[PDB]
């Protein structure tokens with residue numbers, strides 16, 4: 018109806034001015050593609066203008082190119098595939114429209130990874146996101162859908178016991194004390210301040226139906242209705258990535274089984290893996306990483322390059338840890354789609370091991386050139 | 394609340410005794426203005442008492458006229474504008490509340506200054522400072538904020554390349570000899586001995602989250618978290634001020650670009666230019682100068698007159714808190730607001746040549762007074 022009104026205007030009159038923009042959406046949205054897709058709509062009523070709104074509002078930057086678009090439901094990726102495919106291929110370094118994504122949530126396929134030198138790895142974690150099929154994604158979901166998702170999530174999470182026994186914390190009723198504890202634990206999320214997220218409409222009705230759940234041992238954490246229906250995180254001190262990944266896989270499996278009993282399932286397909294709001298999170302939507310002490314390597318000229326070759330990413334940290342050590346970094350896999358969860362965790366395990374060997378060499382004041390890896 | 398307690402005492406009982414003080418703050422702070430602004434506070438909690446403490450604690454300075462107050466966050470200049478505006482006007486030769494700041498980082502607009510006499514100018518340097526919006530300034534920032542700033546600065550600076558490729562050296566990671574070596578060679582900020590630094594609260598937690606980043610040749614350097622979040626410096630031996638300035642403009646613009654790509658912006662506004670801790674560093678926050686041998690002029694009557702005439706300030710060989718040794722004076726532009734960066738460097742280039750002229754004649758007994766220029 019509203020779209021019907023826009024259709025009365027020539028396509029070029031509604032076409033966004035992206036002359037100063039720098040995001041994936043802007044790169045692919047040609048005057049032709051816009052005229053071609055602007056009349057389309059998903060069953061929930063999500064249109065091309067809805068998909069690209071955030072990319073129009075947020076120009077992005079030359080160096081850091083943002084995605085500039087979001088899916089509003091599972092059908093968005095199909096209906097507007099001519100937009101998403103090029104963006105997906107570009108963002109995930111060559112992932113073709115015909116490629117297949119393999120999912121592997123079997124910890125036993127992981128080789129080693131249970132002994133990352135604790136003298137360097139302070140903590141390990143693996144996180145992902147999931148969408149419940151049948152409901153619209155955060156940018157487009159109604160208060161009703163969101164509340165239904167929250168109910169489904171809470172039921173399941175409250176059924177978990179033993180190692181995964183825990184409790185739910187609704188943001189709405191959260192006390193100052195709970196809020197602080199969660200903040201000290203790095204388990205809290207607030208209303209997004211990022212315009213990329215705000216412009217998509219995902220922050221509507223905040224904090225209605227949003228919540229945080231974590232097990233009593235504080236090694237398993239779930240965020241409900243934030244960027245995606247569910248955000249799942251497994252973590253713990255030390256470098257036992259295998260243990261962290263095992264809890265990750267077990268937790269996801271149990272939750273899924275709980276959903277299936279009520280006839281619900283995660284959004285997933287052979288091409289895009291698990292479906293999520295932002296194209297950059299498709300496939301495994303998995304980020305496996307470690308907080309690692311690398312005071313020597315961190316100050317080395319080829320640090321960023323080595324990470325790149327190992328297909329890893331880094332971020333500095335701002336805690337007392339890096340202050341005392343003089344170089345603690347948050348390192349994780351860079352890939353998301355076209356690699357299974359196992360292969361992704363494997364690259365972090367393998368990558369970290371080499372990082373540690375280099376750090377030790379540097380400690381001894383030796384060279385690390387012979388240890389340099391080739392781009393993987 | 395502490396301020397609430399103090400508000401229980403009449404304003405006259407809390408009013409500081411500035412009878413033996415000689416700083417800009419002292420020239421403006423009246424009992425009336427104090428009573429009017431003492432109940433105010435910024436979102437961060439910075440109060441008038443916090444703003445003026447250093448000026449109450451420090452009646453004067455052995456080498457320069459001091460401001461006597463500091464800003465604790467970007468909002469300080471607005472909430473306490475009735476204090477700052479008069480000071481800013483006095484410190485920056487008449488800059489009024491209605492005036493506008495102009496920027497000009499175009500090296501090409503600088504004429505000459507590429508060959509200041511090497512027999513006089515030992516080295517040329519151009520520096521400025523930048524504040525990251527959203528964080529409190531050094532007088533008030535928490536250990537957490539300061540650590541966050543260092544984190545952001547290190548990741549950004551690690552992207553510079555070419556002649557600007559560099560490395561970060563955390564203060565806490567240098568040996569005692571390494572730190573003093575950099576200080577004595579005029580590259581690193583001195584130890585927290587400054588009277589302003591101590592009294593304003595900027596020495597807290599030292600040396601936590603403080604450090605210096607610089608390229609291989611140490612011709613482009615960045616101080617992290619000293620008196621300002623960032624102090625960008627370009628320097629080299631000799632008198633080729635133009636090359637120093639060109640490198641300065643280049644590096645500076647790349648730095649801003651890198652921060653923008655991360656959704657961060659420097660504190661700035663049309664009126665005050667770039668926002669820094671000390672009002673004396675507003676606008677361009679630029680201090681361009683040379684280390685110059687002037688044994689004659691140094692011990693001359695109207696030397697301070699020629700400098701005040703040329704809008705130039707003199708400092709010791711080791712900085713503002715030091716005296717000139719071996720006849721080597723630090724001569725730089727005095728004002729920073731109301732003039733563009735190019736105009737500022739131009740005044741230093743033109744000024745130096747007049748200084749060398751006066752020197753060349755004083756060394757020939759031809760004590761000249763005709764060279765005396767008109768105050769610009």
Ligand SMILES: Nc1ncnc2c1ncn2[C@@H]1O[C@H](COP(=O)(O)OP(=O)(O)O)[C@@H](O)[C@H]1O
Nearest residue numbers: 516517518579680682683684710711712713723
């Ligand atoms: N022209 C110059 N050449 C070399 N070193 C300089 C020059 N100017 C300043 N320095 C050095 O910079 C340091 C800081 O001095 P200060 O007076 O505080 O300057 P600023 O405020 O600009 O940083 C000192 O160590 C000083 O020796």
Ligand SMILES: CN(CC(=O)O)C(=N)N
Nearest residue numbers: 458459460461589671673
């Ligand atoms: C107090 N000072 C010195 C300084 O800020 O470094 C002034 N320039 N007013």
Ligand SMILES: [Mg+2]
Nearest residue numbers: 582620712713
């Ligand atoms: Mg200084």
